[PDB]
Amino acid sequence: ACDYTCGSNCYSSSDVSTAQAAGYKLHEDGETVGSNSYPHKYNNYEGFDFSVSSPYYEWPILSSGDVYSGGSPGADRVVFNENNQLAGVITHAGASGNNFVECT
Ligand SMILES: Nc1nc2c(ncn2[C@@H]2O[C@H](CO)[C@@H](O)[C@H]2OP(=O)(O)O)c(=O)[nH]1
């Protein structure tokens, strides 16, 4: 059930998988949505120890279960690479400024 905990939001592997597929599809087509143009490159300023190689891209994952479509992105993000491999699930929740912390 609670595979990933982002602040108080609980995500299953299915939730992450569904969000990742949607974000990768848009990346593949070269399209973006929302005021911050997702999905966009994630430079890894936080220095997370990802097991998959870059480049990384961040895409919002919504607590409601809906697939992000341009509205309010919220605090949570799924990070995937060019091979459509999951790098990690991160969040602004519990972090300072525009920084991210990993979901556990
Ligand atoms: N915090 C953070 N921001 C990143 C990173 N990669 C790209 N960004 C973008 O760098 C700027 C400063 O944080 C923002 O535009 C942010 O996009 P988001 O705000 O959409 O995440 C990253 O690794 N960490």
From Swiss-Prot:
The active site is at residues 40, 58, 92. The keyword Kinase does not apply. One of its GO terms (molecular function) is ribonuclease T1 activity. Monomer. The chain holds residues 27 to 130 of 130 of the full protein. It catalyses: [RNA] containing guanosine + H2O = an [RNA fragment]-3'-guanosine-3'-phosphate + a 5'-hydroxy-ribonucleotide-3'-[RNA fragment]. This is Guanyl-specific ribonuclease T1. Keywords: Disulfide bond, Endonuclease, Hydrolase, Lyase, Nuclease, Signal. Disulfide bonds join 2-10, 6-103. It comes from Aspergillus oryzae (strain ATCC 42149 / RIB 40). Its EC number is 4.6.1.24. The gene is rntA. GO terms for cellular component: cell septum; hyphal tip. Belongs to the ribonuclease N1/T1 family.
